[PDB]
Amino acid sequence: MKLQLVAVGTKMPDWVQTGFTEYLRRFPKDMPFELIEIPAGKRGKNADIKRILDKEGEQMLAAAGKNRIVTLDIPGKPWDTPQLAAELERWKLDGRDVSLLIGGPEGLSPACKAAAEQSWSLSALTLPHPLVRVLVAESLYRAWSITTNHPYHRE
Amino acid sequence: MKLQLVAVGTKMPDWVQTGFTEYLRRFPKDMPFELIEIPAGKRGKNADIKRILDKEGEQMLAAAGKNRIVTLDIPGKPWDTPQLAAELERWKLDGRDVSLLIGGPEGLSPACKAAAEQSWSLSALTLPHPLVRVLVAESLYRAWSITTNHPYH
């Protein structure tokens, strides 16, 4: 089973790219952790905001294919770390890869919300998408460490 | 008013520091945002974690002085961004600087918890210290931006 982050935006700040990678690199060969970046739509003066968001979401859903769709969304389940570890174990059972969907600054499209099999809230706060990527990688790493009975690695 | 993060640990990786100061630097000259690092106690083979923690806490509380003390702790208030902006408005009315206390992985001492005037939970998840520093700086920036009608949020 692979864990696939499907996220809007390319060219993250270098510190985000570095921190993100540092967690991603912890995952072993038997649990691939991968990133798909969806281009952010350009929002000019007369932009159709609803249409741009729908296109972002269409691309995200295309990338997720037949995977289990978990959205990152502020109204989702406020899982604690033991809970997230239990969900990671649960994700193994049906054989699918898992796509974790992170929206851009205007959030997830309606189609992405309708498609969500599960939804996960990291915080009550409105978080910026680059930081969300890092938080998802770290927290999934932490969950991996719990499911595999390894001490947490603080670099 | 100043915001002062009082945080255990002196070994942050450059990427964490960089992200942290990406937000720290955005605060305006009239609301300085500062960091004070407290050394982590050595957790050797026969060390009493309670004593190590008590010592971190004494140093954290000495750094905070007479400031309003807000602890970052998982049982704290799960503030949303609007509520965090409202808290920033409350802090401003107080007159005192604010110290935001961030423990290491073993947490905060009983004296620090007892000294907290408010406590703030960022997440149900067990977040690592470095990401707590970045999250505190960004979220408070966000809240500041709401209070001043700056476009960031």
From Swiss-Prot, chain B:
Gene Ontology terms, MF aspect: protein homodimerization activity; ribosome binding; rRNA (pseudouridine-N3-)-methyltransferase activity
Pfam families named among the record's database cross-references: SPOUT_MTase (PF02590)
UniProt catalytic activity: pseudouridine(1915) in 23S rRNA + S-adenosyl-L-methionine = N(3)-methylpseudouridine(1915) in 23S rRNA + S-adenosyl-L-homocysteine + H(+)
Compartment(s) where it occurs, according to its Swiss-Prot or TrEMBL record: Cytoplasm
Enzyme Commission no: 2.1.1.177
One GO cellular component term: cytoplasm
Keyword field: Cytoplasm, Methyltransferase, rRNA processing, S-adenosyl-L-methionine, Transferase
InterPro entries xref list: Alpha/beta_knot_MTases, RlmH-like, tRNA_m1G_MTases_N
Residues that, per the record, bind S-adenosyl-L-methionine: L72, G103, L122, S123, A124, L125, T126, L127
GO biological process, one term: rRNA base methylation
Job description of the protein: Specifically methylates the pseudouridine at position 1915 (m3Psi1915) in 23S rRNA. Specific for fully assembled 70S ribosomes.
Assembly with partners or alone: Homodimer.
Family: Belongs to the RNA methyltransferase RlmH family.
NCBIfam families listed in its UniProt record: PRK00103.1-1 (NF000984), PRK00103.1-4 (NF000986), tRNA_RlmH_YbeA (TIGR00246)
HAMAP family: 23SrRNA_methyltr_H
Listed name of the protein: Ribosomal RNA large subunit methyltransferase H
